[PDB]
Design a protein around this ligand. Structure first.
Ligand code: HEC
Ligand code: HEC
Ligand code: HEC
Ligand code: HEC
Ligand code: HEC
Ligand code: HEC
Ligand code: HEC
Ligand code: HEC
Ligand code: HEC
Ligand code: HEC
Ligand code: HEC
Ligand code: HEC
Ligand code: HEC
Ligand code: HEC
Lengths: 86, 531, 531, 116, 116
């Protein structure tokens, strides 16, 4: 029997615009965002802590409980202070 | 019907005081020096905490094969010598043990490429240093690690612990002489230890493993009418009517793709083919003896998951509300038992229990603790033992009242839970169900009435009643561990004598389960329990 | 659930004092005047020693047909006259009793050449002089003498003697009105008297006879859970799962060529198709109520033979040791019963048994012998009867203590023997097995305690307890043989009134059996037993 | 009807599997469909009793046959035995829940003997 | 996914008709299904933006291509032109409702040009 892993999308926003180069921590996994501002994680069932950090000093946190074969998109806005020139 | 003492050659008739192990016929089995189990026979000691008091027979070697067989200090002698190739195994046994080879040949293990899984893969090459393959042998990474690990996911009361906890540390088994409780070794060790369960050796057919009846050889009878409840329920009616119709039941299909007209044990409990059989269970309730409202908001996810299984053939509402009825039937059951246990508890606090625990033959520990005393609910003088320590819960060596309580909760109540869970309406009512608990309550009342009427008379007449000798000792009672421990190790208990850590000590509840409870409890605002 | 006294027309309600054979409804069966069995109804007397006291029903004519049907004095009337050819039997019955002809036409008998074994061959040509064919009719030299002789090789407690001994000299059947024990006639006579057993008339298919379920119709229930033990065991699990799979169970094969995945009753007991079903039995132990260590060196050769049967699908060691476990369970069971019996025996010796045998209704014999008295072990004033004479072993017309003792050895103990023998671990433990005896031991002790406490109180207060009237007489009790003998033949017993030689007088153990035992006792140096 | 089948074929697969096997689905000129027994409005669904099956247009024969039964028959096992069941009334529900599930069926639901 | 399709095939037929025609439904080893774009939890459904389509595992190429656009392109027509639209901000909503519906699409929703 194969336990189908959950798929978690995490989007980092700064009042609408995607944050480039933000680091998203979900469980033990780390992803540094591209132009999307979106990281996709494939995770085994369980409860996880999502944390989005960006070099400006802004952070967003959300705790998520994932079942078997769950698909969840998470959208976290870090405010206007997370918007940096170029 | 008589105890026939004629016809049978006279020369074989057994006479008083003659050994029982002579093989002479003793009428009704009377007047014979109880010789006890062959302590000289080449065998292995049981593993575990109570190893020192575990009296074993030779037969017991096969049932925990890792410790009780495969060791060079314990391996049974075999007449056949030499180290053989697979072709040799098959050639010789095909006539010596013909059934085994017919089986093995049918099995896929024999056809496996490039190399087959042959006798020697599971047993070895040296016919002197033969091994017996345990669950671990099947569950190698190279082989069947998946199913092994799945099965091991099981907690207490599962196929993962049914030997190492429930049997290796089985109160009665330890207390009594083996043979009394032989069937217990043969039944409990299997699922955890021998992967020939459900899919029988040496054929190992998943097709036959996927059949409901496979589960009946253990899940039946006095303290778990699982089979009987399923069988007689409408699911079992459907099953029996249809099970050989291929348009209704195709056993070749993997459970994942299984589209039966009605459900099988495996369809619900081994959903997806998951070898953890307990994977969908809500909470462990000591066989259904302990009580819980499974419909309650706390277990909402776990009961919803159940509704997702029934969903395949019923509307969510139908199942949801049916599984609710079970909960009600479970709650109304424990109501009855509380009144039953009250009547029983009263006779102990009042002290007019006939007899008191202190007068009975000492329990497996050597202590005189009350039978029905649940440690985490009872403490005081009249109960006995240290704080929070339970008695030896049993139906034997005790008052009728103590007996009819155990019976009521440990048999009849478990017919209401499993009866209602499986759709057998009679198992939860007329057939020793609710109406059985009714019957026993009446029987417990009357058996208190009598114990009071007498003990009141003996006070007003001034006789001090002496508990009879048969409560203390007796031919059987004397063979038990209690009397041994009292005599031989006077200032200690079995727990004192067996200090080493138990199964509970090493094996914990999964983290993800503890987390879920805490989350759901704070979610609803209900406080926790004590130690 | 109520005793419904409505809806059904009143005209048909029976009122107090009215005959029970009127056909009127008596609520809960109360208030009716017992008219007894129709003694004017054309029927046969039963054969054997106790013919005079054997009350019979018309239906019994079929069950021992040579004596009860085939004699001119007894043969029942028939509305159809004439002597007929076979063609005529078939043509007429094809409509009159369709199923019989359907079965006959399927049978090999109908197809036989040069002449078929037709209705007339088994029943006769003259419709006014019809006969019912017994085992003797089938077992003629010209026909099936082989199977008749095979079956006839059986000793006491076999298919050879189950009518002539067990049933014809059945204490309870003789004692009671007929109908009370009607089922006993219908069950017991069949194997010995009628060869439509196992292979049903009129099809007589050996293929259906090879199925395990054939045995269940008789080999089940309270005093021999043969079927239940087999069925729920892993052999029975394998059977139920595979029985309709021709690749696993081929019932068209003869038993000599049987290559099943798992065993059938026939596979083990009718090895090679031998009709002596007891052929492989080690020693007769009175349904397993009597105790023997079958694994003892005395029975080595006989146990070895059993291992030879298991050998087919298991290692000798595995089978030997498993059957050794059975032996241990059997010995440990009798240990318990010895303790149980002691409690009951002590009540009798101390004279505090409530009541003593003298205050019970007279037994079938017309005597007041203790129920549990075994003539070979018990002798004294308290037990009653002559030296060596046993009591009427029963669950009826006795004390609770006597009853529970009967139940413990006569029911629960047999579940342990049969359970362990057939691989039903729960039958030997939880399901009224070992733990059944445990529960009954408690029940016996409690009943002993209460009786002793009352006797002590009555002594001190100066009451001499007069045993109640219902122990002596009652509506049912009055209809028994006991009261009739005491009243009508005051000085004598049933043995006096039936002086003819019994089955045991004319039937002895085979020479080879005595020869084997004597040889083995000398070989091992064990003392021979007494009468 | 198409919509009942399509949706339930996934939502409650077993029911549709059973329905498709049934003669009801194959009946002409019009099938006895989910809607025929349950209704069209999902907010006003109904559960079909023996009365629904036993309509003159359908299976009046079997309904009338069963209804010929007296006391203690399939005709009265709900209306009398269960509806006026002393113990069931006396006790909390659940104590005798099984009695409701067992007794009502023969009289009230024709999915008895021949399963839905 | 089976459940999304079955239920919506009746509830919102046109969406399922379109989906079944799409390459997404036929994709192997696993299809890009309703759940892939919208989520599994019906209480936690999401609407997939250009960022969702433009994930590295999927259509990063097209996302990056579009994103190369400067001011007045499909890359900025929402974020600049519409989000900082003087008139839209100035007026009651509805006065310029059409501006939201038109401007956001190219940048935010890849159902543009190739319809969902
Ligand atoms: C010991 C721990 C075990 C091992 C190793 C295996 N099993 Fe079983 N098993 C059971 C069933 C009903 C099936 C069919 C499952 C399905 O339809 O999906 C199986 C199947 C297997 C298989 C085949 C692998 C596969 O699914 O493709 C293997 C290799 C296997 N099992 C190994 C039932 C049971 C069972 C009854 C409760 C027990 C105790 C075990 N299985 C134990 C083992
Ligand atoms: C005997 C060899 C068994 C067979 C065959 C099957 N099971 Fe079992 N099961 C067995 C034991 C001894 C135990 C637990 C004993 C204990 O430690 O308490 C179990 C446990 C279960 C459970 C869990 C029950 C609970 O936790 O309260 C389930 C759900 C279960 N078993 C189901 C099950 C099914 C469906 C089987 C057939 C495929 C099956 N079991 C086989 C012993 C045996
Ligand atoms: C072949 C036709 C058999 C004969 C003859 C006997 N047994 Fe058997 N037995 C057979 C099978 C196919 C199985 C199932 C194996 C499995 O994996 O479960 C069994 C099972 C048993 C068992 C229980 C299984 C176990 O604990 O190992 C026992 C105890 C057992 N068999 C013993 C036994 C004895 C004593 C027999 C002779 C009287 C016997 N079996 C006959 C196949 C066959
Ligand atoms: C689905 C329709 C089922 C089938 C088929 C069988 N059982 Fe079951 N079982 C089912 C439910 C809904 C429950 C109650 C779960 C709950 O906690 O609410 C059970 C219960 C059991 C248990 C006890 C599990 C526990 O206490 O944790 C056991 C041991 C069990 N069932 C075994 C079992 C067996 C052997 C079956 C085949 C005959 C069987 N079940 C059928 C649902 C279903
Ligand atoms: C008439 C012949 C029916 C048709 C056509 C369908 N069903 Fe039915 N259904 C029928 C009966 C007699 C019953 C029992 C009603 C009761 O009171 O118990 C049912 C029951 C259901 C149920 C609920 C019971 C359950 O098993 O969950 C559902 C959800 C249901 N039926 C759905 C259903 C669907 C989707 C159908 C179309 C394929 C359908 N039924 C056909 C009688 C009849
Ligand atoms: C009823 C008609 C029976 C059928 C069918 C079968 N058996 Fe039987 N069996 C029956 C009786 C009444 C008795 C003995 C009664 C007595 O006189 O004590 C027996 C005996 C046996 C025995 C011997 C038991 C003993 O204690 O020695 C065996 C081993 C036995 N029967 C097995 C058996 C089998 C395997 C059958 C199916 C093929 C079978 N019996 C059919 C009654 C009936
Ligand atoms: C059940 C315990 C049986 C009783 C009682 C009798 N028979 Fe039977 N018979 C039985 C079986 C299981 C079989 C098949 C055995 C086999 O060899 O495979 C038979 C077979 C016969 C046959 C066919 C003989 C042959 O060619 O193999 C005959 C003619 C026969 N039996 C006759 C017979 C008679 C006359 C009986 C009464 C005394 C009788 N049988 C009893 C099972 C049982
Ligand atoms: C082989 C594996 C067996 C099958 C299949 C059945 N039984 Fe058996 N039976 C078997 C053994 C090894 C024994 C013990 C014999 C001994 O004394 O060692 C028995 C016992 C009986 C008995 C009692 C016989 C006696 O001598 O007292 C009976 C009456 C009996 N078995 C009947 C029986 C029936 C009816 C079966 C089918 C359901 C059956 N047995 C299966 C071995 C095997
Ligand atoms: C449960 C759903 C049942 C099924 C399936 C069958 N029967 Fe039934 N039957 C049932 C009940 C609750 C009752 C009567 C209860 C009462 O009001 O007293 C009956 C009644 C009968 C009767 C009449 C009994 C009497 O005392 O007159 C018969 C003869 C009968 N049932 C037979 C029967 C048969 C042959 C069935 C299968 C086809 C059958 N019933 C199914 C409950 C249920
Ligand atoms: C509405 C949803 C549009 C569709 C469909 C297409 N285009 Fe577009 N386009 C749209 C907007 C709102 C804008 C820019 C708004 C702004 O921020 O100023 C554009 C931009 C272009 C441009 C660039 C114009 C410029 O001044 O540089 C081009 C060349 C263009 N669009 C072309 C184009 C083509 C060829 C399309 C069909 C395939 C197309 N667009 C679709 C709005 C929308
Ligand atoms: C000759 C015949 C062989 C050969 C070449 C092999 N085996 Fe055996 N085996 C044989 C016999 C006669 C017996 C039974 C001995 C007895 O009890 O009387 C066995 C036994 C086994 C066993 C069972 C051991 C036990 O019960 O504890 C096993 C597991 C076994 N044999 C396996 C085996 C393997 C793997 C072989 C090939 C390497 C092999 N045998 C060869 C007879 C013979
Ligand atoms: C490794 C080598 C092993 C071991 C130690 C065991 N088995 Fe298996 N088994 C193995 C193979 C290569 C196969 C063929 C199918 C496959 O590649 O998965 C099997 C087959 C089975 C099956 C399925 C049989 C069928 O489909 O008809 C079962 C149920 C099975 N094996 C069980 C099993 C058990 C219980 C074992 C220990 C006693 C065991 N196996 C050992 C490879 C290996
Ligand atoms: C019910 C009773 C019964 C009705 C009353 C009568 C008269 C008998 C007779 C006996 C006797 C006698 C025996 C021998 C044993 C003893 O201890 O006295 C008893 C055996 C018995 C077996 C044999 C089981 C074994 O030996 O292992 C079987 C198969 C019996 C079954 C019938 C039964 C058919 C369903 C019914 C009714 C009775 N018996 Fe019996 N009998 N029987 N029995
Ligand atoms: C369990 C009980 C129950 C739960 C409490 C209720 C209320 C009933 C009701 C009755 C009544 C009333 C009858 C009529 C007889 C009488 O003596 O009062 C009773 C009949 C009954 C039968 C008929 C058998 C016959 O007539 O030969 C059947 C088949 C019953 C079975 C159900 C059952 C399903 C498994 C459960 C649960 C109960 N009964 Fe009953 N009932 N019943 N019964």
């Amino acid at each position: 029997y194969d336990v189908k892993p959950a798929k978690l999308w995490v989007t980092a926003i700064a009042i609408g615009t995607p944050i480039v180069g933000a680091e998203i921590k979900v469980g033990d996994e780390e992803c540094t965002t591209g132009n999307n501002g979106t990281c996709v994680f494939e995770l085994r069932p369980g409860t996880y802590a999502i944390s989005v950090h960006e070099h400006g000093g802004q952070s967003a946190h959300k705790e998520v409980s994932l079942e078997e074969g769950n698909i969840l998109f998470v959208s976290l806005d870090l405010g206007a202070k997370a918007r940096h020139p170029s | 019907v008589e105890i026939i003492t004629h016809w049978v050659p006279h020369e074989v008739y057994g006479m008083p005081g003659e050994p029982d192990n002579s093989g002479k016929v003793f009428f009704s089995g009377l007047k014979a020096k109880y010789m006890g189990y062959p302590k000289d026979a080449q065998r292995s000691p049981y593993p575990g905490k109570y190893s020192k008091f575990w009296k074993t027979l030779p037969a017991y070697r096969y049932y925990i094969p890792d410790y009780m067989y495969n060791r060079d200090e314990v391996r049974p002698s075999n007449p056949i010598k030499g180290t053989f190739k697979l072709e040799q195994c098959v050639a010789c046994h095909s006539v010596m043990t013909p059934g085994i080879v017919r089986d093995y040949n049918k099995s896929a293990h024999s056809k496996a490429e490039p190399a087959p899984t042959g006798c020697d893969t599971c047993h070895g090459n040296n016919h002197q240093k033969l091994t017996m393959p345990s669950s671990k042998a099947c569950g190698t990474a190279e082989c069947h690690e998946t199913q092994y690990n799945e099965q091991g996911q099981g907690g207490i009361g599962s196929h993962a612990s049914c030997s190492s906890f429930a049997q290796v540390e089985c109160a009665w088994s330890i207390e009594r002489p083996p043979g009394d409780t032989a069937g217990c070794t043969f039944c409990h060790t299997s699922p955890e230890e021998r992967c020939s369960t459900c899919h029988q050796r040496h054929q190992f057919d998943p097709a036959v493993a996927r059949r409901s009846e496979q589960c009946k050889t253990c899940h039946w009878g006095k303290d778990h009418r699982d089979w009987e409840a399923y069988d007689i329920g409408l699911h079992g009616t459907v099953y029996q009517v249809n099970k050989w119709d291929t348009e209704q039941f195709d056993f070749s299909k993997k459970l994942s793709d299984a589209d039966y007209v009605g459900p099988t044990c495996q369809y619900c409990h081994m959903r997806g083919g998951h070898h953890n059989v307990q994977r969908a269970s809500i909470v462990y309730t000591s066989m259904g003896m302990s009580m819980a409202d499974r419909g309650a908001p706390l277990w909402k996810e776990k009961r919803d998951r159940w509704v997702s299984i029934c969903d395949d053939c019923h509307s969510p509402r139908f199942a949801r509300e049916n599984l609710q009825a079970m909960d009600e039937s479970v709650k109304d059951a424990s109501l009855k038992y509380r009144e039953t246990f009250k009547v029983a508890e009263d006779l102990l606090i009042d002290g007019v229990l006939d007899p008191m625990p202190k007068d009975l033959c000492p329990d497996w520990s050597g202590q005189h603790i009350w039978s029905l005393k649940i440690g985490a609910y009872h403490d005081g003088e009249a109960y006995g033992g240290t704080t929070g320590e339970s008695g030896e819960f049993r139906m034997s060596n005790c008052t009728d009242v103590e007996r009819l309580c155990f019976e009521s909760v440990g048999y009849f109540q478990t017919y209401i839970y499993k009866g209602m869970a499986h759709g057998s309406w009679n198992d939860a009512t007329y057939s020793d169900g609710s109406f059985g608990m009714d019957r026993w309550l009446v029987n417990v009342k009357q058996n208190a009435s009598r114990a009071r009427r007498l003990a009141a008379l003996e006070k007003k007449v001034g006789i001090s009643w002496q508990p009879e000798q048969f409560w203390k000792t007796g031919e059987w009672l004397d063979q038990l561990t209690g009397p041994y421990i009292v005599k031989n190790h006077p200032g200690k208990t079995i727990f004192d004598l067996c200090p080493d850590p138990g199964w509970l000590d090493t094996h914990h509840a999964p983290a993800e389960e503890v987390e879920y409870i805490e989350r759901k409890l704070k979610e609803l605002g209900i406080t926790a329990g004590s130690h």
